[PDB]
Amino acid sequence: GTILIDLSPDDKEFQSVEEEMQSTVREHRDGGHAGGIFNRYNILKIQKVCNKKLWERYTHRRKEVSEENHNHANERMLFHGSPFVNAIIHKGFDERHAYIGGMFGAGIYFAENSSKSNQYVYGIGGGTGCPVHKDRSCYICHRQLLFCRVTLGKSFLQFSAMAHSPPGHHSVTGRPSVNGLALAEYVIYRGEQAYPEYLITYQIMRPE
Ligand SMILES: CN1CCCc2c1cc(-c1ccccc1)[nH]c2=O
Numbered sequence: 791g792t793i794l795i796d797l798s799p800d801d802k803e804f805q806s807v808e809e810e811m812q813s814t815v816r817e818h819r820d821g822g823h824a825g826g827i828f829n830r831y832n833i834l835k836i837q838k839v840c841n842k843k844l845w846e847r848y849t850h851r852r853k854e855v856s857e858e859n860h861n862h863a864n865e866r867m868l869f870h871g872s873p874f875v876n877a878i879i880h881k882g883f884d885e886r887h888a889y890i891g892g893m894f895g896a897g898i899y900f901a902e903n904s905s906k907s908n909q910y911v912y913g914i915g916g917g918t919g920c921p922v923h924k925d926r927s928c929y930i931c932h933r934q935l936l937f938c939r940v941t942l943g944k945s946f947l948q949f950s951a952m953a954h955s956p957p958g959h960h961s962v963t964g965r966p967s968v969n970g971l972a973l974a975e976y977v978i979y980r981g982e983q984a985y986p987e988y989l990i991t992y993q994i995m996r997p998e
């Protein structure tokens with residue numbers, strides 16, 4: 791039941807999603823190994839993901855979390871990079887989309903920095919890079935990220951450099967504690983706590 795609606799670049803909604811994408815690029819401590827070398831993207835397409843069943847699954851869980859946390863869902867818009875972007879937009883997030891080896895346990899991970907999620911589009915640590923050229927820094931091949939609506943509820947704060955959430959919490963927040971420029975990362979342990987709202991198709995751009 792998923793349909794994808796193209797947004798026009800003239801649409802304010804396209805422009806505000808593009809701006810979140812571009813403005814949350816940072817330098818990474820791997821010098822570009824996982825995700826490539828770039829300071830900005832070429833946005834090719836932004837599509838709204840529309841699925842009634844998946845949306846109702848999300849809002850049902852959101853109300854549950856809200857009612858356990860003084861009517862506060864603590865909802866954020868966050869990036870997600872994954873080889874499984876096509877299954878996610880059709881079937882929703884579930885345990886097969888979890889990062890088993892993640893630093894906060896086996897859950898589904900999200901980033902405030904778009905460039906952090908970009909490191910995962912071709913697999914963990916960038917995998918072997920694009921399927922066509924085997925280049926983690928490919929400037930030709932089209933890449934896709936999700937910009938997702940995520941319910942955090944009561945989030946466990948981890949200071950730092952499928953499982954269950956810590957007792958009494960709905961998520962984990964990974965607060966950057968060494969790299970002063972990094973934004974936060976988040977983990978949920980239930981697929982129903984995220985909805986994949988936008989599909990963004992892009993290229994990374996070679997710096998000039
Ligand atoms: C570990 N983090 C940091 C926050 C961003 C992020 C991940 C992991 C993944 C990931 C996705 C699928 C399979 C394994 C890891 N995707 C992401 O976008």
Ligand SMILES: [Zn+2]
Pocket residue numbers: 920921922923924925928929930931
């Ligand atoms: Zn390529």
